[PDB]
Amino acid sequence: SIDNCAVGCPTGGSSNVSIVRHAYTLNNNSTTKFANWVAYHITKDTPASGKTRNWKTDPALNPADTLAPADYTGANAALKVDRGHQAPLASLAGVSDWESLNYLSNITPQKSDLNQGAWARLEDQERKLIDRADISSVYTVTGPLYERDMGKLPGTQKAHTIPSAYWKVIFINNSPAVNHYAAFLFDQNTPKGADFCQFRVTVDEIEKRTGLIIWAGLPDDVQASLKSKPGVLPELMGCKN
């Protein structure tokens, strides 16, 4: 009865079952130890400011299939990474199970310059959409790419795969079949001062680089036509051209 996707959650994730919460729906990867995709639904009632960050192992997963807080010891000193959210805390922290935004199934080792720079500026504009009187929902899917070796967390002996990039696919209101949409993709090494508007892509490119089908309940002809066309939602988020 919780629908975080509206037009069908993504197919193609490594796990056949996904975790469904009020905060998000997530598909875990027991090999990489990170979520393949995280889908969430911002409304006027979901943002909350100032919540704290008590990182915790996700209790719904086997502990061997995800990370624990200990696994991040030394990671910033070794790799210049932060504990980066997939589903964003401030946009969703009013939901009834908000503490799950700080479960490590919703976190990856994200380079600090990306986390605190363009990724954060995109989060801020994504959240600001919901303040518009005619925007009642923002539906987003976000996740990693795994395309080059980014190193290993020094604080764990677990096999894991740090992402090489992160993407976000967004639409407003009811469905990308009728409503504006956007897709963005950022390498881990994105400079801190980068403008997030320079990282617009198509949904098709993200699918091709992930093995996923996003918005998988849309009709075939809608998928074929809109997924290879960059959307115009970024123009409402301050972007030009």
Which positions from 133 through 152 interact with a copy of itself, judged by CB under 8 A? 134-135
Number of residues that bind a copy of itself (CB under 8 A): 22
85 is catalytic: yes
User: Least Å distance between CB 83 and Mg ion?
Assistant: 8
The entry of a copy of itself, Mg ion, none near residue 164 (CB within 5 to 8 angstroms by kind) is none
- State how far the Cα of 169 lies from the Cα of 69, in Å rounded to an integer: 28
Among 10, 13, 47, 84, contact with Mg ion (rule: CB under 5 A): 84
User: Which value, to the nearest 10 degrees, does the dihedral of the CA atoms of residues 13, 163, 197, 217 take?
Assistant: 0
User: Which value, to the nearest 10 degrees, does the dihedral of the CA atoms of residues 202, 200, 179, 4 take?
Assistant: 80
Closest Cα partner for 199 from 227, 168, 164, 172?
Answer: 168
Two tokens at 101? Answer: 């935004």
User: Least Å distance between CB 99 and a copy of itself?
Assistant: 32
The entry of Mg ion, a copy of itself, none near residue 135 (CB within 5 to 8 angstroms by kind) is a copy of itself
Which positions from 83 through 142 interact with a copy of itself, judged by CB under 8 A? 132, 134-135
The entry of Mg ion, a copy of itself, none near residue 94 (CB within 5 to 8 angstroms by kind) is none
**66 forms part of the interface with Mg ion (CB under 5 A):** no
Strands 19-20 and 181-187: unpaired
User: Least Å distance between CB 89 and Mg ion?
Assistant: 8
Q: Which residues pair with 39 in a beta bridge?
A: 25, 141
**85 forms part of the interface with Mg ion (CB under 5 A):** yes
Binding residues: 115
Q: Which run of H or E residues covers position 188?
A: none
Among 81, 95, 101, 172, contact with a copy of itself (rule: CB under 8 A): 172
> Residue 78: which residues within 8 A CB-CB, separation 6 or more?
151, 153, 154
Closest Cα partner for 189 from 84, 87, 126, 118?
Answer: 118
Which stretches of the chain bind Mg ion, using CB under 5 A? 84-85, 115
Using CB under 8 A, list all residues that contact a copy of itself.
Answer: 132, 134-135, 172-175, 177-180, 222, 225-226, 228-229, 231-232, 235-236, 240-241
- Residues designated catalytic: 85
